[PDB]
Copies of this chain bind each other. A is one copy, B any other.
Amino acid sequence: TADLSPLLEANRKWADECAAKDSTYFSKVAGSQAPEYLYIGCADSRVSPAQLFNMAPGEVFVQRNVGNLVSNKDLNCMSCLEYTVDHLKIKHILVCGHYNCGACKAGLVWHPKTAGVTNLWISDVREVRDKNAAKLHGLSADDAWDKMVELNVEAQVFNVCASPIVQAAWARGQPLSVHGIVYTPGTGLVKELIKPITGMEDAGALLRADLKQHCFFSESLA
């Protein structure tokens, strides 16, 4: 059966207990939100940002897609970025990858001829991979996987920092930080991969790739 009764019952029991412990738990967000965080993470069923950070409704705005990817040409992720940064004025963007991420493994192993949309989607993972032969080759299957996850976080942090939305927000002096983090489904713990990046100065210090030259390329020419 496809009956939803038991699901709905679990929700009702949850909202009942929540509101019993704190009468304004839901009511205070009945007509507005003011989260301080955007989280961009993987769609993987093991990785729920509000649960894992013990956040209540109204604290974290969420984009989740296969592989936690950020591209300037993806209107879905870019709309979550633009709405949160420009209208909600969130303060912090958490870019979260996770170990055991099948999208990262498929990015390592699949032949690109593979049919379907997921294989198109994870092209970004191949691009990150391809720039890192030297860190990936010769590693055990497992270690290569872990490394791919990590490299993917770093690249997606760079993409968030280089995004027109973040770049415009920094240029107008809006406070905005970007965090590279990674989660372990099998332990429920988050680790910090990259320390906070609050602007171009921190990005030059903390990112391998050169954000400054990316933004001001013309200054590297004759």
Instruction: Give A contacts to B, CB under 8 Å.
Output: 1-4, 7-8, 10-15, 18-19, 25-27, 29-31, 33, 35, 37, 43-55, 57-66, 71-80, 82-83, 86, 91-92, 100, 108-109, 111-124, 126-127, 129-131, 133, 136-141, 143-144, 162-164, 167-168, 171, 175, 177, 179, 181, 184-190, 192, 196, 198, 209, 213-218, 220-222
Contacts and interface: CB of A to CB of B under 8 A. Distances in A.
Given A113-B167, A213-B133, A185 B120 contact: no
Contact of A45 (B19, B47, B61, B162): B61
26 contacts: A1-B175, A2-B92, A2-B179, A4-B181, A4-B192, A8-B192, A11-B190, A29-B186, A30-B187, A33-B46, A37-B45, A48-B60, A48-B62, A51-B57, A63-B65, A65-B80, A66-B79, A72-B112, A75-B75, A78-B121, A83-B118, A108-B217, A113-B167, A130-B213, A138-B221, A140-B222
A101 to B, nearest CB: 11
Given A45-B62, A120-B72, A141-B222, A189 B112 contact: no
A66 B80 contact: yes
Nearest to A105: B218
Contact of A186 (B30, B49, B73, B76): B30
Copies in the complex: 4
Contacts of A220: 133, 136-138
A44 B88 CA distance: 11
B130 A164 contact: no
What 6 A-B pairs are tightest by C-beta distance, nearest first? A30-B186, A15-B188, A2-B177, A113-B167, A48-B50, A2-B196
